[PDB]
Amino acid sequence: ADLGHQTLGSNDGWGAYSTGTTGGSKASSSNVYTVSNRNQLVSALGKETNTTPKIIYIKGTIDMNVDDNLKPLGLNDYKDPEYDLDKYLKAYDPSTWGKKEPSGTQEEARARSQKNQKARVMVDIPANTTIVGSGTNAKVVGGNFQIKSDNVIIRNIEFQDAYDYFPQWDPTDGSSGNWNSQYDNITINGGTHIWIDHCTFNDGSRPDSTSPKYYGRKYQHHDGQTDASNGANYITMSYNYYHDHDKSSIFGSSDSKTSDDGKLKITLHHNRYKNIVQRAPRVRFGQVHVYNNYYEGSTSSSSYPFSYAWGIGKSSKIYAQNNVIDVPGLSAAKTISVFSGGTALYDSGTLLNGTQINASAANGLSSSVGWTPSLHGSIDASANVKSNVINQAGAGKLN
């Protein structure tokens, strides 16, 4: 079968559980589309509830920050008339506002601004849909695909620069607060039976180094790359290339969302994380099989310094096998970061800078996650992960 008709293999990760991931492989020819701009993409997707099996070929670069005439949109097009960045910053400055949640005129104007952008950049992917890039240069620039539905395949696309013109200030987030943006390249928001394969994820022509600091914190225009929340389940992400980005992959959005318990069943294999700062993945609650992934970076880079790979969040059940981390100088313990409620990590065959480590034991964790993955393809020895992943992960390594 050609790319548009390929499905997830019957043993290939949590995505293959139960009914599996067939996407739009059963489509008739009247639901096979080739799209090259936002309008064509939106028309082909139809409404949230268009469950008819469909295949969507992306040809060229689809910029999502565009009006209905495909004219480019920026800050001043999206801005609410009351919003003014200068005024937002003077309102919420910790030396006059303190650490209370922003409220009043500029936060309200900011929220409405963000909604205006969201209506353009965020697109929902309905059930039984395969979206695949044609050739080696299929790109989505500015867009956030949201998948709330079952049975979706996304492959062979370079996603770039899911950029938010209206980051929110949150002074309660850590000890000096943070800026947060809304847009991922892909957000699996309660979606199920999803395969994300041979995609590339990066920050395009607007890396975080071109963002200023406000209140001493990076004015962050980006959020995740491939995130999962709100009971998302049964997902395989394979052979993708994440690079030159801060927050990569967050699975479970809140310690209060204990309905994520027994869900967030996700398999990550043969992905490349190069110059990724953090969260690769950060997990709450999920049974997440992480195997044969390659992580490379520098703790002293000036653009995207490595901080950690795996975030051991509340009641997380990461089962990690034969993953390879090349970050010179990094202490074994600091391959991971443990958050409140994070108590367990199983990891075997972890290589850090050529040396076999036990990340779980280096942090005093339990290695009992209470499950063992049965559904996986063959597991590579750790010694071959770097080559297989460098040579095979990412968009345009099929067409």
251 vs 319, which CB is nearer to Ca ion? Answer: 251
Tell me whether residue 246 is annotated as binding. Answer: no
Burial of 261 (C-beta count, 10 Å sphere; 0-12/13-18/19+): middle
Q: Is 246 in the site for Ca ion (CB under 5 A)?
A: no
C-alpha closest to that of 251 among 290, 295, 284, 276: 284
The least distance separating Cl ion from the CB of residue 250, rounded to whole angstroms, comes to 5
Q: Which two tokens stand for residue 93?
A: 């400055």
The least distance separating Cl ion from the CB of residue 253, rounded to whole angstroms, comes to 7
Which position among 63, 184, 244, 380 is part of the footprint of Ca ion (CB under 5 A)?
A: 184
134 vs 146, which CB is nearer to Ca ion? Answer: 146
203 vs 223, which CB is nearer to Ca ion? Answer: 223
Tell me whether residue 223 is annotated as binding. Answer: yes
Which position among 161, 197, 227, 347 is part of the footprint of Ca ion (CB under 5 A)?
A: 227
**How many residues sit close enough to Ca ion to count as binding (CB under 5 A)?**
4
Question: From CA 22, how far away is CA 26, in angstroms rounded?
Answer: 8
Question: From CA 299, how far away is CA 29, in angstroms rounded?
Answer: 50
The least distance separating Cl ion from the CB of residue 227, rounded to whole angstroms, comes to 9
Region binding Ca ion by CB under 5 A among candidate stretches 31-39, 184-192, 213-221, 366-374: 184-192
Reported as half-sphere exposure (CB side, CA atoms, 13 A), residue 381 has a value of 2
Q: In angstroms, how far is CA 350 from the centroid of its own chain?
A: 23
278 vs 360, which CB is nearer to Cl ion? Answer: 278
Whether 282 sits among the annotated catalytic residues: the reply is no
Region binding Cl ion by CB under 5 A among candidate stretches 56-64, 175-183, 248-256, 332-340: 248-256
SS3 13: coil
223 vs 380, which CB is nearer to Ca ion? Answer: 223
The least distance separating Ca ion from the CB of residue 271, rounded to whole angstroms, comes to 17
The least distance separating Cl ion from the CB of residue 345, rounded to whole angstroms, comes to 17
**How many residues sit close enough to Cl ion to count as binding (CB under 5 A)?**
1
Region binding Ca ion by CB under 5 A among candidate stretches 37-45, 83-91, 215-223, 327-335: 215-223
Rounded to whole angstroms, what are the CA distances from 337 to 64, 100, 372?
A: 34, 27, 22
SS3 180: strand
Q: What is the DSSP string of 82-124?
A: T--HHHHHHHH-HHHHTTSPP-SHHHHHHHHHHHHHHHHHEEE
Region binding Cl ion by CB under 5 A among candidate stretches 179-187, 229-237, 246-254, 339-347: 246-254
| Binder of residue 24, out of Cl ion, Ca ion, none (CB less than 5 to 8 A by kind) | none
C-alpha closest to that of 318 among 330, 303, 304, 335: 335
Burial of 5 (C-beta count, 10 Å sphere; 0-12/13-18/19+): middle
The least distance separating Ca ion from the CB of residue 223, rounded to whole angstroms, comes to 4
Region binding Ca ion by CB under 5 A among candidate stretches 56-64, 90-98, 100-108, 176-184: 176-184
| Binder of residue 191, out of Cl ion, Ca ion, none (CB less than 5 to 8 A by kind) | none
Q: Is 260 in the site for Ca ion (CB under 5 A)?
A: no
Is the bond preceding 53 in cis, omega lying within 30 degrees of 0?
Answer: no
Tell me whether residue 184 is annotated as binding. Answer: yes
Q: Which of 38, 155, 272, 279 is catalytic?
A: 279
Question: From CA 366, how far away is CA 15, in angstroms rounded?
Answer: 27
* DSSP tag of 366: B
Question: From CA 236, how far away is CA 152, in angstroms rounded?
Answer: 11
Q: Which residues of this chain interact with Cl ion, rule CB under 5 A?
A: 250
Catalytic site residues?
279
Residue numbers belonging to the annotated binding site:
184, 223, 227
Residue numbers belonging to the annotated binding site for Ca(2+):
184, 223, 227
Q: Which residues of this chain interact with Ca ion, rule CB under 5 A?
A: 184, 223-224, 227
